[PDB]
Every structure is written in C-alpha cells, then in structure tokens.
Design a protein around this ligand. Structure first.
Ligand SMILES: C=C1CC[C@@]2(C(C)C)C[C@@H]12
Length: 515
C-alpha cells in the first residue's frame, strides 16, 4: 500500500473486497433512499436530507428524485416553515439555486438593517444560520449586492464564533467551511470526509449512511481497476523513468476524480487522466528540460501533426512527444469507434494550442517580458491545460458530435473560458513576472497582499459568471455542464503537502470504508 509505487498501482483491479452480496444490498438500500427523498417529510427536514445525500457524493444516484422533491417544495404557497428563519431561508435558497430553481436575493433583506444594508447583529449568535448564509452566498451572481454582503458578514461572524461552538461536529463543519465553501469543494473528496462527519450527526439517517459507505466502496472498486490500467499504460510509455514529472500519473488521476468520479464515465475518466499526465510531463519539458530549438521543433511537429523530424529530438523529449501523439490519436479514434466522429483533428488542435501557449511563456521568460495581467491570463488560461482537458471531455461525451459542435466548444465560449481562467488563477494563488499576482504587481505597483486580494476578487467574479451561465439555456448538456464546474472544484481542492495528498489518495482511492 503506497500511492507512489507503480508495482502496487499496476496490481490494482486484480482483487477487490467488493462482493455481489454488497451490490444486491446496494440495490435494496438505493430503493429506500429513493423512497425517503420522494416520500413524506417536513420541508426543512427534507432540504437537510437532500443536502446530506449530495454531500455524501450520491446526487449522481438520485438527481431526478432530488429535483422532483425540491420542485414540489419550491411551489408550496406555505412559507411559514422558512420565512423569518435564517437557517431555513438560506438552505432553501442554496438548494433551489443548485437545482436550477431561481430564488431572489431579496429573501435575505428582512435579516438586514433597512438603513445600513448591514446584516443584524442578533444573527451573530445563530451558528447554523450563519453557516447556511455563508454556504448560500456562493450561489450568487454579479450585482447581487445582498449576497456579496452575506459573504463578508457571515465569513467575519463565523471566524468570530467558531471557537464558541459547543458541538465538536459543528465546530469541524464550520472550520471546513471557512477553509472552502461546499460550492467550491470537489464532490468525491468531500464525500469521503463527510461520510465520517455524517455518522456523528444528531439527525443522521442510518439507512442513508449505510448506502453511502456501500456505494463509496463499489465506486472505489471501479477507480482501483482504472488506476491499474492507467499505471500499466504509464509504465508501458516509459515516462515513469523520465527525469521529471514525479508522480504525474497518480496526480493526474487524483485531479480527474475531482472532474468526474461516476463509474459509468470510467473510459472518459481514464482518457482525461492520460491527457493530464502528459500535460504535467510536457509542462516540465517546456519549463525545465528542453532547449529553445528542441521546444520550437516539438511545437512545429505538433502544429503539423507530422512526426518526420522527431528523431532530431533527444530520447527524453522524443518519448513525451510521441506518447502525446499516440494517445491523442487513440482518444480521437475512440471518438470515431464509440461516438461515430473522428476526434483526432480536435485532440491534435488543442495540443498544438497548448504548446504554442507554453512557447509564448518560454519566449516571455527568455526576452524578460513583463505581460499585463490581461495579456498573461489570455495565454495562461490555455497553458493551464483546461481547454485541452475540457474540449477532449466534450468530444468524448456530447450526443451527436459534429464539426459545428466541436468548433464552438474549441472557440472557448464564456462558460468554458470562465472555467479555464478560474483553474489558472486558483493554481497561481496556490503558491517570476509570469504568474497572476506578480503580473498585477508589475501592472499597478500593488503590494503582494493587495495584488493577492485583487486576484481572489477575480475568483469570486468568475464563479458568479459560471453560476449565472447555469441558469441560462446552454447549447451544452450533462455531463459537460458538470465537468466545467468540477474542474474548478478540483483546482480549489488541490491548491489550498505530500502527507496531505497521500492521505487524500489513500483514503479516497486505496482503503475501503469499514462496513
Ligand atoms: C498544469 C496543470 C493543471 C491541470 C493538470 C492536472 C490534470 C495534473 C495538468 C496540470
């Protein structure tokens, strides 16, 4: 049991402690959870149950029932159960907005002083109210000034009352929230954390908890089989023996699990994990290893999709190039075989764009250029690799793929571009004139502190644009809508170190939950 050892990883999938007993039991428990979601409950208890299902990582199992239950609740007429109750108002606001039912920000106006616009100090003691208002504030859109205030008020008040909480479970939950709000957390990682928290909750439903543990283990069995296949592939490429990208395959796979964890998306997840491993490896080629002539040739070969000159590159560069080429061809071919559409033009194109973006960064560094923040981000939203990963994910999943459809996604419309910019700025915040904070410092003369606060403000702004894009009609469908949001959550989760990562990998991918 070592997450960084390829002998161990290549053995995964061979055995699993998940039995067909476990699977029949999961089918019976699923039917009872489904019935609990659709069945009688008081509305606040129903909101709390639905929120728990999501946090345990099970929305993917009960999407239709959860939407059906919230739709019934939203069209009630009776509102005494929530009106004048901050906790209930805030939970309802968030769950309805998460599930495509609009609630206006003015539901919070009654909790503000009419003269200052400030939240009332009498709320400064209601911990679960404050917590629900904090988590709700992240579902806000641009110009929803009450929700911007709700965030700053609830953050300040929670920081002040965290140490006054009596319930150890509630204290842990509030600490967790102040680190990252639930809206920004990666689903699969939050599910493993929350299974242990939920077990200790007063209101805990034992049927739901048992289902959550069983489903967690069943899903984890698919992940172990994928890791096995990917580790055997990676060792096959020989890139594991290369002087750089230490732990690139398993780091990529852990990122991919943030993007998409469901078993039915296993083949797509494996291909996203391959691309991510290659991105990390080639990033090091362009950053540390290659000479400018080597990198110009790598870029030209990729732009032309023409490997005639590849033997001019040294072995440690030639092997990443040809693995990128071969895997891009394999992924485009999977689209032809499985989806009826040859994807090679699109995998080749996004790799050429990505290497051009690396080449521009390398030229800026070589020539001592200081780009503006805007000039930097225009290139760095491509260099982060998410146009590559997201266009690929759309290629593999869209119904009735066409050149028109792939050309639109590849043009990075606002919804997609917002996700790519977020992933770049979150990475950059997770730590040189070529990173977000330093560019803004060069452009404005701001301090590190002030430049960091500006870039944090850009994270909040681009989230508000994503949030609103999801209430708008879209040419996109599931699962691509979810991928776009979930790559950002993956970025937040991994850019908040080697023991923390290993713990996440071992607890989510390697060790089953004890039943
Ligand atoms: C630069 C990045 C951000 C995305 C990435 C992951 C998939 C390992 C390739 C690395």
């Amino acid at each position: 049991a070592n997450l960084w050892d390829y002998d161990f990883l290549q053995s995964l999938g061979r055995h699993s402690s998940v039995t067909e007993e476990h699977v029949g039991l999961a089918e019976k428990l699923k039917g009872e959870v489904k019935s609990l979601i659709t069945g009688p409950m008081e509305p606040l208890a129903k909101l709390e149950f639905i929120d728990s299902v999501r946090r345990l990582g099970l929305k993917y199992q009960f999407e239709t029932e959860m939407k059906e239950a919230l739709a019934n609740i939203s069209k009630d007429g009776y509102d005494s159960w929530w009106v004048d109750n901050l906790r209930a108002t805030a939970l309802r606001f968030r769950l309805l907005r998460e599930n495509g039912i609009f609630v206006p920000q003015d539901v919070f106006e009654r909790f503000q002083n009419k003269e200052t616009g400030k939240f009332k100090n009498e709320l400064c003691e209601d911990v679960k109210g404050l917590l629900n208002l904090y988590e709700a504030s992240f579902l806000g859109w641009e110009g929803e000034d009450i929700l911007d205030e709700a965030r700053t008020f609830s953050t300040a008040q929670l920081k002040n009352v965290e140490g006054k909480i009596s319930s150890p479970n509630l204290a842990k939950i509030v600490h967790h929230a102040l680190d990252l709000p639930l809206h920004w957390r990666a689903i699969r990682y939050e599910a493993r954390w929350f299974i242990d928290i939920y077990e200790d909750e007063e209101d805990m439903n034992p049927t739901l908890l048992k289902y959550a543990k069983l489903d967690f283990n069943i899903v984890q069995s698919f992940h172990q089989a994928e890791i096995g296949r990917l580790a055997r592939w990676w060792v096959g490429t020989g890139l594991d023996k290369l002087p750089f990208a230490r732990n690139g395959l398993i780091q990529s796979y852990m990122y991919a699990i943030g993007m998409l964890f469901e078993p039915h998306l296993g083949e797509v997840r494996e291909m996203e994990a391959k691309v991510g491993a290659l991105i990390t490896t080639i990033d090091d080629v362009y950053d540390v290893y290659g000479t400018m002539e080597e990198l110009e040739l790598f870029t030209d070969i990729t732009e032309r999709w023409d490997i005639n000159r590849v033997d001019q590159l040294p072995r440690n560069i030639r092997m990443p190039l040809l693995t990128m080429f071969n895997t891009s061809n394999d992924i485009g071919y999977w689209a032809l075989k499985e989806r009826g559409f040859n994807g090679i033009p699109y995998t080749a194109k996004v790799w050429a764009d990505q290497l051009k973006s690396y080449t521009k960064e390398a030229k800026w560094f070589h020539e001592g250029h200081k780009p503006t923040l805007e000039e930097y981000l225009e290139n760095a939203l491509v260099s982060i690799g998410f146009p590559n990963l997201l266009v690929t994910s759309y290629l593999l999943t869209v119904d009735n793929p066409t050149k028109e459809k792939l050309d639109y996604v590849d043009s990075l419309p606002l919804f997609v571009r917002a996700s790519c910019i977020l992933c770049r700025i979150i990475n950059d915040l997770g730590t040189d004139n070529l990173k977000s904070i330093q560019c803004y410092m060069n452009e404005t003369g701001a301090s590190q502190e002030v430049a960091r606060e500006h870039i944090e403000g850009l994270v909040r702004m681009w989230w508000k644009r994503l949030n609103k894009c999801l209430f708008e009609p879209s040419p996109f469908t599931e699962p691509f809508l979810s991928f776009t949001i979930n790559v950002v959550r993956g970025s937040h989760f991994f850019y908040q170190a080697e023991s923390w990562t290993k713990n996440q990998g071992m607890s989510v991918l390697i060790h089953p939950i004890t039943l």
